[PDB]
Amino acid sequence: AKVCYFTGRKTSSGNNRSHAMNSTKRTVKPNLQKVRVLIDGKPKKVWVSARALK
Amino acid sequence: KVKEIRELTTAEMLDKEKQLKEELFNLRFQLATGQLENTARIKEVRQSIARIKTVLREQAN
Amino acid sequence: ELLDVIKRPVITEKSMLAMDEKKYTFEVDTRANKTLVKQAVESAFDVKVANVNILNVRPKFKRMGKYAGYTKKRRKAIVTLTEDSKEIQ
Amino acid sequence: MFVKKGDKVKVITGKDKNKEGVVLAAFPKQDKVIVEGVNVVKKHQKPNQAAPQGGILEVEAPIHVSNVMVIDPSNGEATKVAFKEVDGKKVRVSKKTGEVL
RNA sequence: AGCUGUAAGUAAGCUAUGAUCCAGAGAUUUCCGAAUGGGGGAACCCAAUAUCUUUUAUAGGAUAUUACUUUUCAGUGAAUACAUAGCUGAUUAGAGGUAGACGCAGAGAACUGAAACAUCUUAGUACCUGCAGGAAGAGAAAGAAAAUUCGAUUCCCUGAGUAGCGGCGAGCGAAACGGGAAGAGCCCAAACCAACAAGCUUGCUUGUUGGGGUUGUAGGACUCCGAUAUGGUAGUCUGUUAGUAUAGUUGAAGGAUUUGGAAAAUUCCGCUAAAGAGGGUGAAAGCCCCGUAGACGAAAUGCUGACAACACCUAGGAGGAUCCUGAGUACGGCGGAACACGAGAAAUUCCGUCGGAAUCCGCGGGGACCAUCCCGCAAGGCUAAAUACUCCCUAGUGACCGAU
RNA sequence: GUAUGAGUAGCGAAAGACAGGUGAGAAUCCUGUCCACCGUAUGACUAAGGUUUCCUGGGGAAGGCUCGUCCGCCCAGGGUUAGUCGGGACCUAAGCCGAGGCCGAUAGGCGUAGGCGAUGGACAACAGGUUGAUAUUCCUGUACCAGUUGUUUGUUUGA
RNA sequence: CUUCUAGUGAGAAAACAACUGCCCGUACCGUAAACCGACACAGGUAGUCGAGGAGAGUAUCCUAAGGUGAGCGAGCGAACU
């Protein structure tokens, strides 16, 4: 779960914000699933985003 | 004195190289046992060997 | 290279006694074999050799003028003959 | 150095002013010169390989080269020196009437 | 005309048949180290395969080749037949260091200030990691504005401590107009037309090469006629010279006297200057030495111009029947961030997640939102200069230090 | 940089005495004689560690808690020898590294095949002599291990 | 190391003679004045050998082989520690 093969969606950072405006660090991730695709003949199991399969 | 080393062939080159290396062996044995009045001849032989080797490199491209 | 291998003879009081049993001491090259020295000696004098022995010598701290540092390393080989002789002086 | 090892020379400054002599040795890169009979000094030696009886001995000391002047061999007066174009061994062509030194 | 460094001291030598020394181009260059035949406690140890050597022979010596990944091509090849994993060989590039500087990204504090402290500040600073280049980054309007407009980007002055933001507290803090340095613009996708291969629907659907075509005053395709010339380049290790960096050459004019160990000082009487900058000399020198102002010079190698070739690129007028103009995109809900702008009445620009257009009778913006008017045409690529920095080399400078 | 405390505290367990040498100079260095101390150690051998301190000839400015003619100090020369001993050209433990691989903002974390790694496994020589300083290493005598050269039948396989 | 086959696969068994056999260490200290403790420091340092009388003994006292007299002294013979 590191990138996607066709787009580039990867992980980044964000903030939590809790009702008094305190801020801590945080991780944001893309929605990656392992799929078999035909990239030059032989199938491969790669991580692909659900937005590029849509 | 390369003007003479350029008056020879690549066989007599290797021959004089053998001769001068042997001279160095004998000089080195003189200097240790208390002989060799003329110590400036050790440098001269080193430099004649150097000259033969450069000239042989130059001619074989 | 058979003519850069032997450097020179050793002439000390422990080495004069060896010349009376047919043994000769030379400072030889570092990176030389027992066998390579044997070949070189048989080539440069036309003798027949029994038994090279070989040693390494450590450098010595010296200190001349408020500047200190070591002498060279050394290799010493002692060559025994069957029957023949070399005349060094 | 404008003055050579075999050369007659006169003295401008320093207690031997007006003396002449043949140059004895040149020391370029320290710009000094030994002149015959000019800067006599008195040493004190103890016996060593030369003169196993080391007395009080006297030899010349090197003076600075700008305390000196060349003399035209042919005429005998001290001259500033210039360089001119002879058949191409450029020599010091004297001032004071253009003669070769 | 002397010389064999510091470096004395002695011993042997070299040079007028041109030493030593100086500048351009070459040759040699052990071992460790990315270290790369295998290993390892860096500078060590142990091999395999060919050719060559020592020996009667084995033992011994030398030289080449042998990591890993990628990216191109053959051979062999299979659980599983056809063949794809794999394996062997040939080919192509990387890999590490730094200038303790300058740039663009990823991730990202705290002491501190608020006279306590949570929002806020310190501050997207310090530190760490990636990628660079000689500069980077941005760059050719889905722009700035408001009548009467102007035309790519960057940098400086000013606007201005203003308009704003803010436990509206501490504090943070624009832009456009106006004046300047430097100035420059270009190429694709798509429609369409051919050559080839497959689907031989023998419909013309899939594709590969070449042509065409690059825009908002809408432009192109397409049909109609003209022309088949003319303006340029941000291009090459191609020629012709011109200069230039890296050694050098020449270069004016003073003697006596007094005091001293020694004068450049003192006193007399002269000369020189396109040269009275500076350093040395037994004390303070235009005229003693090295220099200076001025005039001259390069076998060789490297730089920068100019003009030549060679390579590329570039045409009008008309029509408006039809076709083209960048899709999981613009945009919307939810959560975060960036804009001077802390969710606020919040436009504009990003990231994650889910939903999701239109096609010139169109689409976006003018700070919620609507109508009308005005300015533009996103979802493709590149680009000199004007600006930042100095490990280093040359030449200099200082009402900068002078051995705590 | 120099005083005061001050010529003061201290001089780090323990038995010496005399004769004679050397020397400018001797409680302290050399030679002798008697006395005294340790002796499951204060004797002999070795693995770490140190790295020339080892031997011979000179020296006496500093170091040595006094002295010094002396020294583990200073100057000049010299010493360490292996088919068989210990390590490599043999084996593997813990642990470590790891082609491909699997994971993860970056950097990187782990791990398969295969390797490195003794403190363990395997593995052929002994007794005596000799130097101022090395000895299962040099020499003498008598051995052993692995190879090489020469003189002493169908690769089917019963060679 | 020892067997058994599978196996590319002239014909090697064992007599004598004479030859070949590489790299690293190797001095010296090592219950210490040479190592760890800033010192020529009453501390610490793995293993083997470790004799006699009397004794169970490696205890204890005196000794053998071997080692040592310990790097400030000469007097006096008060208080006090």
XYZ file of C-alpha atoms (C1' of nucleotides) in Angstrom, chain E residues 46 90 109 177 195 207 233 236 239 258 282 332 347 357 365:
15
model
C 41.329 -16.913 -0.713
C 25.283 -10.342 -25.712
C 9.671 20.877 17.234
C -2.632 51.396 -10.707
C 0.818 3.921 -47.394
C -3.577 -0.111 -35.208
C 16.642 30.436 -35.398
C 26.266 22.236 -35.414
C 35.532 26.330 -42.301
C 80.112 67.222 6.902
C 74.800 48.851 6.560
C -20.997 19.558 -5.624
C -15.126 34.260 -3.709
C -21.681 18.111 -16.601
C -14.229 34.886 -14.047
